[PDB]
Nucleic acid binder design. Sequence first.
RNA 1: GGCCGGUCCGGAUUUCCAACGGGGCCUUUCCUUUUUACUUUGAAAAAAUUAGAGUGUUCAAAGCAGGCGUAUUGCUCGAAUAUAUUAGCAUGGAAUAAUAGAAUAGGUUGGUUCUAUUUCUAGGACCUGAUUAAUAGGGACGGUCGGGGGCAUCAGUAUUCAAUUGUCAGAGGUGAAAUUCUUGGAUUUAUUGAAGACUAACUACUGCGAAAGCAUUUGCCAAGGACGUUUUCAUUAAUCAAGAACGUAGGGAUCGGGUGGUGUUUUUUUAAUGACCCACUCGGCACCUUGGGGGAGUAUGGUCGCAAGGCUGAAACUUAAAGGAAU
Lengths: 127, 134
Amino acid sequence: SSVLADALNAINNAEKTGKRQVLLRPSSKVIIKFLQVMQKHGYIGEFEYIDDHRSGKIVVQLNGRLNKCGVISPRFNVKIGDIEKWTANLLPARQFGYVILTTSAGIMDHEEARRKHVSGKILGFVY
Amino acid sequence: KGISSSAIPYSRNAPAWFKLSSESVIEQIVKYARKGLTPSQIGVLLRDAHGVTQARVITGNKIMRILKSNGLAPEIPEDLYYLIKKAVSVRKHLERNRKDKDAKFRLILIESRIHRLARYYRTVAVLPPNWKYE
RNA sequence: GGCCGGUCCGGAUUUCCAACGGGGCCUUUCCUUUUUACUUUGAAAAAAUUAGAGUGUUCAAAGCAGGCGUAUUGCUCGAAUAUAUUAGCAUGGAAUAAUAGAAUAGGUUGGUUCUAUUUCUAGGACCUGAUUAAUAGGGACGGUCGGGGGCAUCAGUAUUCAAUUGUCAGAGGUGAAAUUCUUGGAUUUAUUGAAGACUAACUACUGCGAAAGCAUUUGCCAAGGACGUUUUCAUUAAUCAAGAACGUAGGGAUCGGGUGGUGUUUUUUUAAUGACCCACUCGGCACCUUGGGGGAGUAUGGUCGCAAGGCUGAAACUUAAAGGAAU
């Protein structure tokens, strides 16, 4: 499987069973950015980066804000006219949750992507 | 299948109790290799006796690199060598008593495990292609 | 912009400290040796294909007029907007998935001249590349562990057979019987010998093997697991076509390995290094608690049945014998 995907499955079902801290290895930098933006939007809490020499272990402490993360396989391009229909058929409601895209100028969710007026390929989603 | 592995430490400016130099280590390594010791055995001998932690962190480079750098390198990789000679020993045993179908099954598995890293080594070209089972 | 005199009793001179910005600049000195997939601009886009707009066609479907002036050099609007691509144009910005990259970087002979109290000396030529080391992987090694396998060997008492005896009417076998053998002594008893087969009790919710399967001892041959490991290599991995060889969490135990503890079994100068208890750990087999809708029926004026009835003999023959039948 992937490296972002199983980490997201871990922090999904661990808070589904209702814990406060999770562990996730191997913690690539796309995982760093992906839950960087979700603690920016207040869906998890603070998180530590234990750094061994092998790959690193991210420890996320989280409260019961979140209910579902998730990745999208594969990661295909979307337009400014496409992100609204992807938020439609990807989130439950409209102004609630986010959709995370690898844009070209950064790594952001859909509202900051359409705020900076850029786009890219779809990465994952959280609500 | 379970786990049984060494866990090399977080330190990499190792190990601060090492009175010895960094040239006598290479001297001991070339001594053991021209005594005819495989990379694993020269590593374990100077780990235990002339106690290094590992030569990749005392010297700045792994022992296969320093064996090539002192002109003492193997002609086939160590894993393929050991697995080849295990294959020839089990073939000699089955040749002796050809009823051992358990040894036949194990020989099929051993030859498949040969072919795995053999085509890996052909794709990376450490030993050159046209190579199929000596 | 702050801090210090020294010219005179608050105007000019000055040192240092901070904040911006300015200029020369420190490090390949020795060596052969980036494109592609995304967002913005302008053309090429024919109606029938859409919708937008004004207008009393008597309304509507239908139809598309700018009209007024000052009908004078001017006052004003409806035919404002639509995919026309997938194949296609050209330009400028930077994450992820590839991709160039990194013409990736260094460290064994003979001859020449310069040296003072043979010491001891200085410069030429010529005689093999660069991340980490996953609770991904395979490999080595150590002590092991197993009814795992192959070969050879050893053992057991049964069973069968044979021999040597000993004693006398029964003995296997059966539900009885029957049958079988037995006075040529069987069955049973004792002493041996041969033969091949098999490894009982120990044997368990224990072990091993990819599965089927796998239990006598010893030796040999190799293999495998797990554990240990500050050993090595660096994605070598995963999954099946095709083909190949074989026929939800938690807890208590227990097996294999390791670590630590500190009491008893143990012992001591021959080498080897046990058993038990307790904890932790790793990995195991386990445990405990979390080809078509139908069937039951009831019926059947269809459809295929079936028993059908009733002394035979016995009919063309009221007919015998013999047999039921009733008595």
